[PDB]
Design a protein around this nucleic acid. Structure first.
Lengths: 50, 157
RNA sequence: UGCCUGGCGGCCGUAGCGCGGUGGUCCCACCUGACCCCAUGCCGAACUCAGAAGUGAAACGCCGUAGCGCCGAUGGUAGUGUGGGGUCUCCCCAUGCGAGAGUAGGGAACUGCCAGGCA
RNA sequence: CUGAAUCCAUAGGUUAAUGAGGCGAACCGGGGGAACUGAAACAUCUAAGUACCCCGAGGAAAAGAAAUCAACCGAGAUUCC
RNA sequence: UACCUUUUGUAUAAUGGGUCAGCGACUUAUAUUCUGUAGCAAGGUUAACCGAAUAGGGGAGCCGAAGGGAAACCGAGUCUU
RNA sequence: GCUGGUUCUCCCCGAAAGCUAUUUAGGUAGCGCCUCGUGAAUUCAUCUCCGGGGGUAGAGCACUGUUUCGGCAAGGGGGUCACUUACCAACCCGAUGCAAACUGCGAAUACCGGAGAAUGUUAUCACGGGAGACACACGGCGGGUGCUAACGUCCG
RNA sequence: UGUAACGGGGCUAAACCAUGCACCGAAGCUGCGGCAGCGACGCUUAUGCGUUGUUGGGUAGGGGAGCGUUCUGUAAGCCUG
RNA sequence: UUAUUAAAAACACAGCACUGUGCAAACACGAAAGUGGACGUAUACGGUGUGACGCCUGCCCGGUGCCGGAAGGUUAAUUGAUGGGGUUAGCGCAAGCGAAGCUCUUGAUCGAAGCCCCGGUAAACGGCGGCCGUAACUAUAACGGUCCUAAGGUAGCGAAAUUCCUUGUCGGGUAAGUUCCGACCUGCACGAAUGGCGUAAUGAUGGCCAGGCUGUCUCCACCCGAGACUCAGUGAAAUUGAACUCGCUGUGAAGAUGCAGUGUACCCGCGGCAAGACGGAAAGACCCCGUGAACCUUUACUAUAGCUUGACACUGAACAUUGAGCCUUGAUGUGUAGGAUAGGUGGGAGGCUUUGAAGUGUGGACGCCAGUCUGCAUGGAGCCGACCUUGAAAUACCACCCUUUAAUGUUUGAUGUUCUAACGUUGACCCGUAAUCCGGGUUGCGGACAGUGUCUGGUGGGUAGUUUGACUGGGGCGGUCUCCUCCUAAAGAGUAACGGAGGAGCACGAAGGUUGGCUAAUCCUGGUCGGACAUCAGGAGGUUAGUGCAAUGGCAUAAGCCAGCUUGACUGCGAGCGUGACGGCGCGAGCAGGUGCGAAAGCAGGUCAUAGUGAUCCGGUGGUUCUGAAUGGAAGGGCCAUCGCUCAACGGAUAAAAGGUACUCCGGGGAUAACAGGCUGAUACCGCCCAAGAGUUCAUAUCGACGGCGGUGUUUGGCACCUCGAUGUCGGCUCAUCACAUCCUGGGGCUGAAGUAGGUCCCAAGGGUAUGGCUGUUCGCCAUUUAAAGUGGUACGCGAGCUGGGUUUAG
């Protein structure tokens, strides 16, 4: 309810994205999180956490 | 306090959401609706009937988790069914003849209470309003007087 | 290979707690000197250092103490599987399995490997 | 052959020749046309352009010669299994 | 302490029959699955139609001997990477 | 999806009124159960022994609640303008009970697996065909509800 | 409603308590005879027997094996004033 | 007026009132013609309410309906400016871009009605209530202080429709009157055309009383006729599994002619009475079910007839006025102090001017004449700005510009005037034609109006098709349906109830992982503001503290606490196991890649775990040249991930649905209520025991507190069993029967029994056990007698005996 579902898009040029939920009311700052990306076969940063 | 008491309360909110989708695009922007909800509205009418139910389930889903009274209250003004809206129009036209017939003794209340009133343009508008009525000409500018007061009524900015 | 100490295990109180005595060459614990190697939301009690001057005070090991904790019979009793019976809200009979609690009693540990010191 | 409003002409009137008027079991084409029922309910739908009503001729009717199909090779009317 | 049905439970005073004679009820068609049986056999089998009219011709076509994937595609291998 | 009837004979086998789901609760599908057919291993059942966890019966009050008796009693109440009282009592101690939602303890049976002598028309399992049924009643045992009131309801 | 709280008569044991010996007592068991299903060994092979033991209450239901009637080929055969 | 149970208070009625209607009237019948209204004309017709007559009809426009007004907001069809996509001539040695044409899509401007909004409309639908406190119960029932309402009952008539106790209680009526009549009051609701009060006459109208009258009755008796009976003739019926068809007790699918026991009973007719054969006549009408049917209701759903608005066509010619966008053209902005008719956003201490200026005048013109702009030359060399003040400082200039508005050209609307040639004419005249149809011709009157056809906006239970799920509750409404925890649960698992307690639809980017580190409640002593915690120094306790949240089980290797790094909360998997019928769900060693932690051994595929959720179909996004109905694309489809449910009825019938039927019907059910019958004694009645106390002494001579055990059980109740293809009630009349827990009579005991008269208890059922008013009564009150006017069973007896007064379908 209060939580807003968000999508994390790889900072690289690929369109592969991950799905997760963050409470925007308490944490409006964009996330700085890196997670494995299979298309580039490495670890890439994820941003734009709504 | 009761699961079915929430049910009818939620169902009442559901038909309210079904009223928003049945409202025109031109009047849809009037209500202070968030962009996330607004984007879901446009997809709601263009989806097939079964998807409308899913969209109605969507519209109800994130509308319950937030506050509803300003949205309902704003919808009430557009439908002109809330009691304070119709009386606001009553006083809005009540200051017309108080201003269109004198032009000087009514501007004081507007500027004293509303600080966004452009008195530079209001006096000129009354000058035209006096001219058309004195010369028994059709009121081609009387309508614009009401629009300006109506626009400033809800914080035109 | 005989005694003492230390480390790693077997089992987890017949394995502990409490009281008294014993130990410093050796094995252990406090105590000294403190530019550094280790880093803090706060000092070298308590974890990291370069040193053996003292002490066995605390702790630890060992021995005795049955005060406590603990184990624990035999019999008895409650319960119960099977079949039958009764005055069938509950009991008895034949047989089988057999309580808990309590008493007598036991109990102040035993054991494997390695290292060091004394014979 | 006669023949007004209105002069011509028409509308109309009379006579003559030709065809039909109605019936018939099914089939044809067209014009209208539901519900019971199914979906285990029911509105999309099916039920069904079915039952039923009307119109026209037929021995059959309808359709019948591509502004058709197909695919870069190609068949050259309609109808029926 | 009748019969039939209903039910956990009926002679039950729960249902049905006054009797006799006749009539009266799991069929048919099209598809699909399995079994028995018969022919053929990696092949089996013809519809419509012609017809010496259940013969014969007719292999149009259907099923199977290769499967995997949604598909392109691959193949005693196939989908995911 | 309801009521009623379904007509000749013989032989063999032969359950349930239960679970799940159902705009479902008198119906239906799968499973549980029945029959027939094929195949398969001492497959399965009975008993003996061995390896298992309970927290049930019982028992207990260490833990969680209720509660009694007696001893020591902090303190609460009044009066005397530190003392006392025929008022009450926290806590601890020894004893006595109870508890489905308590177990420092703890059976009999039930269940799981292994080994074995004997018996049982493979009684065991897998697949395929066809079903029926999914309204149970009573009695005994251990219970919930009810007054252990019921030809009472719901359980194994 | 009429004895109606042993079924009745009736019983002072023909009631109760403990023991012993008997008897009656079912479609239970045994005896005799007969039928049917089920495995297995030996006579042997489309198969019955010296057998062998066992099974055989039964609704819904399943499986197996049969009787009767009409008509068709058999059948211009047979019985038949 | 309900043929065939309701004749009335119901309907109607002349009258009264409102509203609609100007003739081609409104409305109705009709796809339309046409007809009725009416061959009538607002003193007429239609609709609605009331219902003689007399006195009158009080207040309120809040919602709905109606009328008028329209100032304003929202609003379809209609028209097609931008934006994007597809295709490609071409430009590119290619990736890509992209001319024109065509196509698909978002949709700016025009867009009325309608909705609201304003004032009326109540002889329209409708409404006239509270909360605190005072008397008045005066001759007539009217006075204060307030709510969130628009407003609180005028007169008329009070015992009214809630309100109750001593049928309300006094009087008539009667000896006795739950009915009747005017009245006391503690009464005010209705209630004034869904009409109020009174009303003569009228009524097969409701209720009560009185006089005459009588077999209505105590109490019936006789007689006259037709049946009933016998004889002669003709000759049905419903019902029937078969009967060789007794009573009583008990059992039994629970009311037995058929069973067990026992008793009685020769066989068979006839005339009768009806207690039974849960008797006969109807597949109940009383209750339930059906994802049955049909009617009715609506602010339930989807629709529509009809009404109504606009656009397009029929549908035209001359104009006049004027609303809206677009292109420059120059002004245009008086709250105030202030040289004074200051527009907002930036630069700004200067640009301009002899390609000829400050400052003097007219013309045109803005114009609130307060003021200003400007062609012209006169004129012959110049103007500002912080200036102090203003919220804000400049005609010192350079721009996006907003509003108002001035003059051409462009586009499209709206209003008004004239005409006829479309169209209308149920106006006149003439002809077909000895014709109130119709057609043709002239003229008059309207006139591009009305009306009609398609689409569209609004209204639209008037009409049509549906839905209103399951569980039990009631005057109306509610709650439950999914998941999780403990117990119930009987020691594998699982196990239900309207069994007792509860929680969840989240959260966390840290509250996860790794590494390292640490261990509290409660209490004692000491200690300052400081207290029952502030944080502690020393102590018994190794978890009784904590574990994000309800509970449970676990947690020291800590899962509890702190810090660094951190994303393993990763991608493709995943042998195997468990749970369920299955969909699904959970655990999951281990492999490949890339990571974080620590040195390494190793851990990390989320949170200590158990609830924090949703399968499929169909929608958005990205990727995949996977496919692309001739070729190349494209559109579209497929696959993968992904957000997409109060699908909450949570295994999820529609994308879209609420109720009643006593006007109901059909097919089933004792699969399911009520009364009665047998379990029952919670409550209450009856008996006994325990016996403190009161009793002149003295417990049971007579009571007896706190308790216990028993019995019918006729009140207040619940349980499984049913007759729903039928089990008829309450009460009265006739008829009775049985038990004694005895009302009288009879026999006694005790007595606090002198006699009569009494009181209690025991035995005894042979007999007897009332007449009237009230109300349908059972009961009860009253009046009056006796010996009393008994208690219960009889399915609270008796309708195949009667009654229909209550209950009583239809009005």
């Amino acid at each position: 309810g209060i939580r807003e579902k968000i999508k994390l898009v790889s900072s690289a040029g690929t369109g592969h994205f991950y799905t997760t939920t963050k409470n925007k009311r308490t944490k409006p700052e964009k996330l700085e999180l890196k997670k494995f990306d299979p298309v580039v076969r490495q670890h890439v940063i994820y941003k734009e956490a709504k | 306090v009761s699961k079915s008491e929430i049910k009818r309360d939620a169902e009442e909110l559901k038909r309210l959401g079904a009223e928003i989708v049945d409202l025109g695009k031109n009047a849809l922007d009037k209500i202070p609706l968030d962009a996330d909800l607004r984007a879901a509205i446009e997809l709601a009418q263009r989806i097939k009937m079964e998807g409308r139910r899913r969209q109605l389930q969507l519209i109800g889903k994130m509308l319950r988790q937030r506050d509803v009274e300003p949205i309902r209250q704003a919808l009430d003004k557009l439908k002109n069914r809330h009691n304070q809206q119709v009386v606001l129009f009553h006083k809005l036209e009540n200051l017309r003849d108080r201003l269109i017939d004198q032009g000087d003794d009514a501007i004081a209340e507007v500027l004293n209470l509303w600080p966004d009133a452009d008195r530079q343009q209001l006096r000129t508008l009354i000058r035209n309003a006096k001219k058309e009525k004195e010369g028994n000409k059709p009121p081609k500018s009387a309508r614009q007087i009401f629009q300006y007061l109506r626009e400033l009524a809800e914080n035109e900015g």
